């Protein structure tokens, strides 16, 4: 249901951006994904997935544990924010 | 602290998009704002504010009360999702 979000493309960009220790990778990679793949990648359901994923990471856990956990359990529904 | 998010102009776009009864207004206005102001409007703190506001709206609370409530109470910190 989240094919329009290009969530794997965003993840690749974020990992490469962070590996270069750049600033504001979440913001910059959102901009590139928008410019490459268009406005549908900014839907609220895409935003829910990205927020669950990046919150998990920002709060200490590992990027990989956060990605798999979000990808397996989060469909982009607004209620997902209460367990992800 | 959230001046870089251009949240006022985002709401302007969102309200006009809704008055025209268009689809995917969240996506359309996120895209237009970044196409005007660049990657800074896609920072995670902007995303925290917007998610607090739009979740409140998606769950049936009036749009104006969600925006005003979020603007007085949300600074964009990751913990803000726990009460907004």
Author numbering:
A (entry chain B), B (entry chain A): 6 to 89
Task: Give the authors' words.
The venoms of marine cone snails constitute a particularly rich source of peptide toxins, known as conotoxins. Here, we identify the sequence of an unusually large conotoxin, Mu8.1, which defines a new class of conotoxins evolutionarily related to the well-known con-ikot-ikots and 2 additional conotoxin classes not previously described. The crystal structure of recombinant Mu8.1 displays a saposin-like fold and shows structural similarity with con-ikot-ikot. Functional studies demonstrate that Mu8.1 curtails calcium influx in defined classes of murine somatosensory dorsal root ganglion (DRG) neurons. When tested on a variety of recombinantly expressed voltage-gated ion channels, Mu8.1 displayed the highest potency against the R-type (Cav2.3) calcium channel.
